[PDB]
Motif scaffolding. Structure first.
Motif, PDB file in Angstrom:
ATOM      1  N   UNK B   9       0.823  -1.207   0.000  1.00  0.00           N
ATOM      2  CA  UNK B   9       0.000   0.000   0.000  1.00  0.00           C
ATOM      3  C   UNK B   9       0.861   1.264   0.000  1.00  0.00           C
ATOM      4  N   UNK B  10       2.062   1.166   0.563  1.00  0.00           N
ATOM      5  CA  UNK B  10       2.989   2.295   0.608  1.00  0.00           C
ATOM      6  C   UNK B  10       3.587   2.643  -0.756  1.00  0.00           C
ATOM      7  N   UNK B  11       3.579   1.685  -1.678  1.00  0.00           N
ATOM      8  CA  UNK B  11       4.094   1.918  -3.026  1.00  0.00           C
ATOM      9  C   UNK B  11       3.054   2.528  -3.963  1.00  0.00           C
ATOM     10  N   UNK B  12       1.858   2.777  -3.443  1.00  0.00           N
ATOM     11  CA  UNK B  12       0.766   3.329  -4.239  1.00  0.00           C
ATOM     12  C   UNK B  12       0.597   4.834  -4.030  1.00  0.00           C
ATOM     13  N   UNK B  13       0.751   5.606  -5.100  1.00  0.00           N
ATOM     14  CA  UNK B  13       0.493   7.042  -5.048  1.00  0.00           C
ATOM     15  C   UNK B  13      -0.954   7.359  -5.432  1.00  0.00           C
ATOM     16  N   UNK B  14      -1.515   8.416  -4.851  1.00  0.00           N
ATOM     17  CA  UNK B  14      -2.808   8.924  -5.306  1.00  0.00           C
ATOM     18  C   UNK B  14      -2.647   9.461  -6.720  1.00  0.00           C
ATOM     19  N   UNK B  15      -3.700   9.343  -7.545  1.00  0.00           N
ATOM     20  CA  UNK B  15      -3.576   9.739  -8.951  1.00  0.00           C
ATOM     21  C   UNK B  15      -3.245  11.215  -9.119  1.00  0.00           C
ATOM     22  N   UNK B  16      -2.302  11.507 -10.003  1.00  0.00           N
ATOM     23  CA  UNK B  16      -2.009  12.883 -10.362  1.00  0.00           C
ATOM     24  C   UNK B  16      -3.191  13.468 -11.124  1.00  0.00           C
ATOM     25  N   UNK B  17      -3.554  14.723 -10.813  1.00  0.00           N
ATOM     26  CA  UNK B  17      -4.661  15.423 -11.474  1.00  0.00           C
ATOM     27  C   UNK B  17      -4.611  15.330 -12.999  1.00  0.00           C
ATOM     28  N   UNK B  18      -3.409  15.288 -13.566  1.00  0.00           N
ATOM     29  CA  UNK B  18      -3.241  15.186 -15.013  1.00  0.00           C
ATOM     30  C   UNK B  18      -3.696  13.835 -15.563  1.00  0.00           C
ATOM     31  N   UNK B  19      -3.915  12.863 -14.683  1.00  0.00           N
ATOM     32  CA  UNK B  19      -4.322  11.534 -15.123  1.00  0.00           C
ATOM     33  C   UNK B  19      -5.839  11.417 -15.059  1.00  0.00           C
ATOM     34  N   UNK B  20      -6.503  12.524 -14.744  1.00  0.00           N
ATOM     35  CA  UNK B  20      -7.954  12.515 -14.653  1.00  0.00           C
ATOM     36  C   UNK B  20      -8.494  12.146 -16.034  1.00  0.00           C
ATOM     37  N   UNK B  21      -9.579  11.376 -16.047  1.00  0.00           N
ATOM     38  CA  UNK B  21     -10.250  10.914 -17.264  1.00  0.00           C
ATOM     39  C   UNK B  21      -9.447   9.878 -18.055  1.00  0.00           C
ATOM     40  N   UNK B  22      -8.271   9.477 -17.563  1.00  0.00           N
ATOM     41  CA  UNK B  22      -7.571   8.346 -18.173  1.00  0.00           C
ATOM     42  C   UNK B  22      -8.469   7.126 -18.013  1.00  0.00           C
ATOM     43  N   UNK B  23      -8.564   6.306 -19.051  1.00  0.00           N
ATOM     44  CA  UNK B  23      -9.301   5.062 -18.924  1.00  0.00           C
ATOM     45  C   UNK B  23      -8.569   3.921 -19.616  1.00  0.00           C
ATOM     46  N   UNK B  24      -8.728   2.723 -19.065  1.00  0.00           N
ATOM     47  CA  UNK B  24      -8.094   1.535 -19.606  1.00  0.00           C
ATOM     48  C   UNK B  24      -8.967   1.041 -20.754  1.00  0.00           C
ATOM     49  N   UNK B  25      -8.542   1.355 -21.974  1.00  0.00           N
ATOM     50  CA  UNK B  25      -9.417   1.294 -23.139  1.00  0.00           C
ATOM     51  C   UNK B  25      -9.332  -0.015 -23.911  1.00  0.00           C
ATOM     52  N   UNK B  26      -8.163  -0.646 -23.910  1.00  0.00           N
ATOM     53  CA  UNK B  26      -7.967  -1.808 -24.766  1.00  0.00           C
ATOM     54  C   UNK B  26      -6.906  -2.791 -24.301  1.00  0.00           C
ATOM     55  N   UNK B  27      -7.090  -4.034 -24.723  1.00  0.00           N
ATOM     56  CA  UNK B  27      -6.073  -5.059 -24.612  1.00  0.00           C
ATOM     57  C   UNK B  27      -5.866  -5.610 -26.018  1.00  0.00           C
ATOM     58  N   UNK B  28      -4.617  -5.686 -26.469  1.00  0.00           N
ATOM     59  CA  UNK B  28      -4.348  -6.095 -27.848  1.00  0.00           C
ATOM     60  C   UNK B  28      -3.747  -7.491 -27.912  1.00  0.00           C
ATOM     61  N   UNK B  29      -4.311  -8.305 -28.798  1.00  0.00           N
ATOM     62  CA  UNK B  29      -3.849  -9.665 -29.031  1.00  0.00           C
ATOM     63  C   UNK B  29      -3.679  -9.893 -30.525  1.00  0.00           C
ATOM     64  N   UNK B  30      -2.602 -10.571 -30.904  1.00  0.00           N
ATOM     65  CA  UNK B  30      -2.387 -10.914 -32.303  1.00  0.00           C
ATOM     66  C   UNK B  30      -3.108 -12.210 -32.625  1.00  0.00           C
TER      67      UNK B  30
END
Ligand SMILES: C#Cc1cccc(N(O)C(=O)CC[C@H](NC(=O)CC[C@H](N)C(=O)O)C(=O)NCC(=O)O)c1
Ligand SMILES: C#Cc1cccc(N(O)C(=O)CC[C@H](NC(=O)CC[C@H](N)C(=O)O)C(=O)NCC(=O)O)c1
Ligand SMILES: [Zn+2]
Ligand SMILES: [Zn+2]
Lengths: 172, 174
Positions: B9-30
């Motif tokens: 838990x100590x290695x986890x930072x709160x999200x930087x404001x600049x990362x607001x609205x970031x979303x995990x959009x895709x996983x790519x497979x060949x």
């Protein structure tokens, strides 16, 4: 050869009713060192750690991260688990214990022989401002936005060398 | 040994404001063969093909699938693209042309040496009913729900042999 649109969509069936509540819940990647990985995904990319699961008998841990408000995370373990595994688009990082201490060990990112998996991708409001910040933070790049063939998208790497795409959905 | 909660838990930072609205959009497979893959992910797993992208100069196509209503897909190309890439939890299948005709070629699923990627996972209302249908449809299994170490979750394979987990969030494994 490559498929025509018509051929491709012809291979697409409407969802069977039994699958209508299915959701794509996770992508799993093995990580050498969760200290480095957790720092990267939370500090650099802004994900939140939803839950840590440990399995002492099997000697591994699971770290589930997602773009979620931490205040939405249930405190109770059983309620937390049911909540975590019902979220869309989580990232599951698998830590096999000891890998961080083994200098001969490393995971494969799938973009060289033997290839398979390619990357995860993050939608951002602005690729260029995002990568400028990444640059300042010392992040390693596979592909800066204006290099390579496709302009306006980037690839960065996590501490295991997995490719992470940086993309703007409104500029494609 | 593995990390304590405290170390982790100590290695986890709160999200930087600049990362607001970031979303995990895709996983790519060949994928070796888009005919088999599209059939598998749409018919067997119930995903929807959002958009198809072709790049003739480089000889590859991209298929974006997600659990989305077909009727929400914008008809206009530019509007479709902006919509597809703004969805959470999409699956991008990459087809390098010619692979389907090459009997020596196959992709690596990351679950044997050299390991890395493991799987994508589908949350379902009922793992057992889901896997019974999968069996009935001729789906290949890595791990039926009550086999292996963790009971109540399953691994199936897509046409490239990638692992797909089947899990029930209200009925956790073991
Ligand atoms: C914005 C945007 C946007 C638009 C279309 C597709 C994508 N994504 O999500 C890609 O992964 C395409 C990436 C592309 N994918 C491929 O080229 C796949 C084919 C390749 N031969 C492979 O097997 O990886 C690549 O790696 N390009 C590198 C570059 O431009 O320098 C993003
Ligand atoms: C529902 C549920 C549920 C609960 C906890 C975890 C998970 N998931 O998503 C897993 O990945 C666990 C899978 C597990 N993952 C691991 O064991 C991770 C460590 C492994 N050594 C590795 O490297 O993959 C595995 O492969 N077990 C299969 C079996 O039961 O036989 C799901
Ligand atoms: Zn998993
Ligand atoms: Zn991609």
């Amino acid at each position: 050869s490559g498929l025509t649109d018509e051929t491709a969509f012809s291979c697409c069936s409407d969802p069977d009713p039994s699958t209508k509540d299915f959701l794509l819940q996770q992508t799993m990647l093995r990580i050498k060192d969760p200290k480095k990985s957790l720092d990267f995904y939370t500090r650099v990319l802004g994900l939140t750690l939803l839950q840590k699961l440990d399995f002492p008998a099997m000697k591994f841990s699971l770290y589930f991260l997602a773009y979620e408000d931490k205040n939405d995370i249930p405190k109770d373990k059983s309620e937390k688990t049911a909540w975590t595994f019902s979220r869309k688009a989580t990232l599951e990082l698998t830590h096999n214990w000891g890998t961080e201490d083994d200098e001969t060990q490393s995971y494969h990112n799938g973009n060289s022989d033997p290839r398979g998996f390619g990357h995860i991708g993050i939608a951002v409001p602005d690729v260029y401002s995002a990568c400028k910040r990444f640059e300042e933070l010392g992040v390693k790049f596979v592909k800066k936005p204006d290099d390579g063939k496709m302009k306006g998208l980037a690839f960065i790497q996590d501490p295991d060398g997995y490719w992470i795409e940086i993309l703007n959905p409104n500029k494609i």
